[PDB]
């Protein structure tokens, strides 16, 4: 399938070269997979989600996304126009308040929620969790992410936006999950992207168009935007049967575009997420 005039990041993940604008992908499109977006919520009523999004849990007075961040990330995972995996099921877990903040204890509870809640959902092709959040190093936060991964969920987490080594941030620094840095449309490391040995992969993160609250759209930047590209890619590849939740991060690294990014510090992987789809 070909989506013309796609957001640059979608075109990038199906291309061996920057500078194109059509996204190419197998029409299975993540059907039968599920992606949990653990964030500020999801505006499930947005036409772009086509009834495939729902809120499953909140720790606050509403499950609505009063911020936009979670809706934007969910749109990159799975919206019809802005999403990588256009037929996946999206499940929102609101661990962040409408200002985008959340206590680590709530975030940990949300991760353990997903590890159990997947047993209440129909996801025959597999389960992914996208975590566009983080703070300073916490062994308890890392351990929660490790448990979620161990339970059979492909966990993708943001590297962070500090232009620093991600070893000092959580859950970015957890070795067993997929830690995602950000790149721009010219294949440069995004100016804010964290780096370091703990990163597994880069995805598009600068000037990413996606859904927003109030039935709208906007372009924003962050490792928060790169993470759902990788989460959606995992769901797409799992639906294709090419990999599993336990092996998808490694498979994405195996099949990535290699050595094409600039300003990657010595010791950080130079790997850009790529679907290897041959139309």
From Swiss-Prot:
- Family, similarity comment: Belongs to the peptidase S8 family.
Cofactor(s) listed: Ca(2+)
Alphabetized, the UniProt keywords read: Calcium, Disulfide bond, Hydrolase, Metal-binding, Protease, Serine protease, Signal, Zymogen
On the tree of life, the source organism's domain of life is Eukaryota
Q: What is the name listed in the Swiss-Prot or TrEMBL entry for this protein?
A: Proteinase K
In alphabetical order, the GO MF annotations are: metal ion binding; serine-type endopeptidase activity
Entry function: Hydrolyzes keratin at aromatic and hydrophobic residues.
Which residues participate in Ca(2+) 1 binding?
175, 177, 200
Q: Kindly state a single biological-process term from the GO annotations of this entry.
A: proteolysis
Binding-site positions, Ca(2+) 2: 16, 260
Reactions accelerated catalytically: Hydrolysis of keratin, and of other proteins with subtilisin-like specificity. Hydrolyzes peptide amides
Segments forming domain Peptidase S8: 7-279
């Amino acid at each position: 399938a070909a989506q013309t005039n796609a957001p640059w990041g979608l075109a990038r993940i199906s291309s061996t070269s920057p500078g194109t604008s059509t996204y190419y992908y197998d029409e299975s499109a993540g059907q039968g997979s599920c992606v949990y977006v653990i964030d500020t919520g999801i505006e499930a009523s947005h036409p772009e989600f086509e009834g495939r999004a729902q809120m499953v849990k909140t720790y606050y007075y509403s499950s609505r996304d009063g911020n936009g961040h979670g809706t934007h990330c969910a749109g990159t995972v799975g919206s019809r126009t802005y999403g990588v995996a256009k037929k996946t099921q999206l499940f929102g877990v609101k661990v962040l308040d409408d200002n985008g903040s959340g206590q680590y204890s709530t975030i940990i509870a949300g991760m353990d929620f997903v590890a159990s809640d997947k047993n209440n959902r129909n996801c025959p092709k597999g389960v992914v969790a996208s975590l566009s959040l983080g703070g300073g190093y916490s062994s308890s936060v890392n351990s929660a992410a490790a448990r979620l991964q161990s339970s059979g969920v492909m966990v993708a987490v943001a590297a962070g936006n500090n232009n620093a080594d991600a070893r000092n941030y959580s859950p970015a620094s957890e070795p067993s999950v997929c830690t995602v840095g950000a790149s721009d449309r010219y294949d440069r490391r995004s100016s804010f992207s964290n780096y370091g040995s703990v990163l597994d992969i880069f995805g598009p993160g600068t000037d990413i168009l996606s859904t927003w609250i109030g039935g709208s759209t906007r372009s924003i930047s962050g490792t928060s935007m790169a993470t759902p590209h990788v989460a959606g890619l995992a769901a797409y590849l799992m639906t294709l049967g090419k990999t599993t939740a336990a092996s998808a991060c490694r498979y994405i690294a195996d099949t990535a575009n290699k050595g094409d990014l600039s300003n990657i510090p010595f010791g950080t992987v130079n790997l850009l997420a790529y679907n290897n789809y041959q139309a």
